[PDB]
Amino acid sequence: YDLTTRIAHFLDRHLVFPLLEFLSVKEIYNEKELLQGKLDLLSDTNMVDFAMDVYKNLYSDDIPHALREKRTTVVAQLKQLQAETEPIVKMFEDPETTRQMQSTRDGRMLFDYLADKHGFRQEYLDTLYRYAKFQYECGNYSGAAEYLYFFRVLVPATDRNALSSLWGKLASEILMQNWDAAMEDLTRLKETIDNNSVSSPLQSLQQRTWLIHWSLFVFFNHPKGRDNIIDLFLYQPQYLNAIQTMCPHILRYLTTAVITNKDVRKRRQVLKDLVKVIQQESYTYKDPITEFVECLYVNFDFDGAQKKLRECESVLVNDFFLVACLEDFIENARLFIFETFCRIHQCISINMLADKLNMTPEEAERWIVNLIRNARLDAKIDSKLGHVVMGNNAVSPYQQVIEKTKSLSFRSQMLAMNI
């Protein structure tokens, strides 16, 4: 990877406006926590994904974070400080902060439709200038961004504000928990990272991580947007060689849509590059739940693999995100590791298939009835023993070399007979 020479001296020194913190001393499910925090560096005060830490277990420590983000949904952050009933008594700032915003919004809501009804390229941009100010004063006000960044988008600060207000609008619509106006800013982020900038990695790997955040929580077709989140930027999945490869769960939604939403042919491209080499190896050293997906599969295990999937599948479902590819990756971990066993093998006891993958034998029997009908396992089924015989071994492969030495050489010598 080429931009690593910029990373070779910098080594993961990102630049965000909401800086660090994630929800001190914890009890349960700890591999998600730094994972949540290193993205909460880069994802600008989520808005439910603070309380996504809280859905596994309640803490009083979700309070000190979004209290100090009074731009975003002012009154609900007034409610969170009293949700712990804390005398923080300086909450007299957000009503001071909103009052300048109301004088800037409604003082220019007059101008907001002078921007539209005139469409005067000064007076639009004159309104847009004070709303370049105001949508960076508050972009939360994301509907005030949504009216703003639907017309001629480019504010009089086309690079710093028009990113951080549109990434702000990508944040703040998701911070208002909108997704279609975030699908506006899906496109407005994925092109702004594509222009891009000066493209320092401290900007770029942040902007690469900015791609990861909205695509992490699936609402709409991120099973198509997995290809947007793999096959962009020289398709490293973590986008950060940058030894803390912390765009971390991306393999799971990637190998979701391979096995679920695609076929698995085309999972060989996943196992070779997107599992092994450097970045996912780092995330193999980060989450053991993704590890038993891959490391017992790369051992081609048949009993330890299927159950340590199934044990980690009980923790794959513990991905308490807005997820929408949760049991897809879980079920098609079973369905592909059975495809892993019966790929090359000789037989299986249906009673063993029942007891290994914890099903009943008729469920085990009728599943190869489906696996012939899907033509994923081409075999026969012994109807009465409960022993699917799968004996694919070929004899005399000669006829194919023979076919292509006499369809070519016999028929290209035909062509030399016209002179």
Binding site: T4, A8, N241, F300, H345, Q346, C347, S409, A416
Partner: protein, 300 residues
């Protein structure tokens, strides 16, 4: 690589991209660059990675430059090293003896690492099925030690390789260990690392797993039922290794082989050794169709 873990050293070579900066920046730093990728291959060998011991010795051991990459080549060593005054420049410059390194280790790094690789690889080739015969390889570094009918006891560093190579070709893992481990303690080559006990133990299994393959590659036509209980006891290899062996013996080598891992049984039935000559003629006549096509490719 040395003072930390070599996963970083693999990355930072890929990171800083020092394939190009070394040229303009004082090619005695290319000597330090060639010192570095040697020490990459050292910590390829310290981490036991045999391919990277071959591939970090790619800018080094694809050439006889490695003598002069410590600045110690001789003038009449070839018809190239001229002259004494430039030899005075290079050897007033290079190099201190503690900055010299063991090239006999480096050859035993370079030869043995592909010895456990290329011999099951060529045992696929020498089973009357070859299409990937790679020229200019350890195969050719074997050729200088190969055609030696007089060769008695292994005493030289290549002789310990070539003896262990024949022990590797027999499929017996134990016989390689006599030829390598004791003799690199005899030549103090094993006696160089503190990690060398692990490096030996890493290369214990690289001999055990791969001579198991040459056991299967050479005795392939008549093996039509292959155990997994016996081979777990024979080559002293546990089942999750053996399942990682035998599946990759079936999947990656693409041998026609039925497998019942609940029964722990490999069933192969290759069929046939007289039709290996039919494969040997399809080695010949497929070349017949290609240059016939290439007869028209150049001419048109």
């Amino acid at each position: 690589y040395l003072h930390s873990r070599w996963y970083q050293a693999r990355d930072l070579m890929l990171m800083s991209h020092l394939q190009d900066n070394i040229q303009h920046a004082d090619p005695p730093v290319q000597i330090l660059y060639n010192r570095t990728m040697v020490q990459l291959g050292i910590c390829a060998f310290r981490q036991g990675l045999t391919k990277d011991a071959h591939n970090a010795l790619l800018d080094i051991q694809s050439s006889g430059r490695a003598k002069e990459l410590l600045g110690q080549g001789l003038l009449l060593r070839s018809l190239q090293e001229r002259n004494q005054e430039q030899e005075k420049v290079e050897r007033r410059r290079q190099v201190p003896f503690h900055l010299h390194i063991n090239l006999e280790l480096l050859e035993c790094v370079y030869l043995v690492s592909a010895m456990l690789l290329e011999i099951p690889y060529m045992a696929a080739h020498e089973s009357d099925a070859r299409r990937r015969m790679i020229s200019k390889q350890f195969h050719h570094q074997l050729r200088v030690g190969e055609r030696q009918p007089l060769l008695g006891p292994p005493e030289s560093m290549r002789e310990h390789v070539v003896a262990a190579s024949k022990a590797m070709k027999m499929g017996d893992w134990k016989t390689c260990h006599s030829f390598i481990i004791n003799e690199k303690m005899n030549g103090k080559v094993w006696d160089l690392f503190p990690e060398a006990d692990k490096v030996r133990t890493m290369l214990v299994r690289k001999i055990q797993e791969e001579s198991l393959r040459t056991y299967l590659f050479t005795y392939s036509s008549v093996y039509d039922s292959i155990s997994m209980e016996t081979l777990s006891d024979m080559f002293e290899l546990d089942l999750p290794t053996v399942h990682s062996i035998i599946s990759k013996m079936i999947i990656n080598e693409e041998l026609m082989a039925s497998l019942d891992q609940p029964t722990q049984t490999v069933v192969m039935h290759r069929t046939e050794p007289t039709a290996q000559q039919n494969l040997a003629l399809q080695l010949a006549e497929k070349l017949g169709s290609l240059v016939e096509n290439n007869e028209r490719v150049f001419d048109h």
